[PDB]
Swiss-Prot record, chain A:
Higher taxonomy: Eukaryota, Metazoa, Chordata, Craniata, Vertebrata
Protein name: Caprin-1
Maturation and modification: Tyrosine phosphorylation by EPHA4 promotes interaction with FMR1 and liquid-liquid phase separation (LLPS) for the formation of a membraneless compartment that concentrates mRNAs with associated regulatory factors.
Originating species: Homo sapiens (Human)
Subunit-structure text: May form homomultimers. Interacts with G3BP1; interaction is direct and promotes stress granule formation. Interacts with G3BP2; interaction is direct and promotes stress granule formation. Interacts with PQBP1. Interacts with DDX3X. Interacts (when phosphorylated by EPHA4) with FMR1; interaction with FMR1 promotes formation of a membraneless compartment.
Associated disease: Neurodegeneration, childhood-onset, with cerebellar ataxia and cognitive decline: A neurodegenerative disorder characterized by early-onset ataxia, dysarthria, cognitive decline, sensorimotor axonal neuropathy and muscle weakness. Brain imaging shows cerebellar atrophy.
UniProtKB/Swiss-Prot annotation, chain B:
Domain of life: Eukaryota
Family: Belongs to the caprin family.
Disease affiliated with this protein: Neurodegeneration, childhood-onset, with cerebellar ataxia and cognitive decline: A neurodegenerative disorder characterized by early-onset ataxia, dysarthria, cognitive decline, sensorimotor axonal neuropathy and muscle weakness. Brain imaging shows cerebellar atrophy.
Omega-N-methylarginine modifications at: 34
PTM description: Tyrosine phosphorylation by EPHA4 promotes interaction with FMR1 and liquid-liquid phase separation (LLPS) for the formation of a membraneless compartment that concentrates mRNAs with associated regulatory factors.
Annotated protein name in UniProt: Caprin-1
Localization: Cytoplasm, Cytoplasmic ribonucleoprotein granule; Cytoplasm, Cytosol; Cell projection, Dendrite; Cell projection, Lamellipodium
Domain notes: The C-terminal disordered region undergoes liquid-liquid phase separation (LLPS) for the formation of a membraneless compartment that concentrates mRNAs with associated regulatory factors. CAPRIN1 molecules in the condensed phase are neutral. mRNA-binding promotes phase separation. Moderate concentrations of ATP enhance phase separation by reducing the electrostatic potential of CAPRIN1, thereby promoting intermolecular interactions.
Coiled coil regions, renumbered to chain: 1-22
Species this protein is from: Homo sapiens
Amino acid sequence: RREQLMREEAEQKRLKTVLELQYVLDKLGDDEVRTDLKQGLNGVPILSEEELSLLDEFYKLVDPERDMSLRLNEQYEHASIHLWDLLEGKEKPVCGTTYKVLKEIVERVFQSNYFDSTH
Amino acid sequence: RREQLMREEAEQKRLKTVLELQYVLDKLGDDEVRTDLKQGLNGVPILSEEELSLLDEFYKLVDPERDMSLRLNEQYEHASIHLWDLLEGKEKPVCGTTYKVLKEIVERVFQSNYFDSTHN
């Protein structure tokens, strides 16, 4: 019953991580950001064209365009599952890779501290 | 395997609710949308200006402008807690009201089914 409160804290931290991820993926639409990440801070890249492609492709899944076939409460089912699986870092296929690989990529982007500075 | 499946499903459905809310709040910037919600389908408002205002105000809290003084992993702590408190529908003060009230408002917006159609 301290485990429930620990669960709540975990869920909140997960929400925070999701928000941060949404911010990053949103910024990955900028050509400056993309180049600056494709090059390093000194020719040791945080990202490669393949990884960045994987992120664009996952981005397609988690921020889908409104499909007129779906009700609003249906639109983000797969998105929610994609984000949750990403958080879990599972070895289940997605895009051209697994959620584990993607989670690692997101990890390197986060830990580069690129988004702590301004460029 | 059913307590785990329970917990996972609950967390996921909550995540989904968050995404849907983000969609709605993003659409709440359009005056066509805002007007369409202020009138009903028959002059019975889905929202009143006060409620729509409260949503305008809450939106800022859960989608805050980037402050460079904060790290990226610091930027959305309060946002995450706001979304959490909203989901729980707590009676903790926010926007001059409670998360309970906001939850009821958003609930009514969801239940209006306005966003089941698309107008893009």
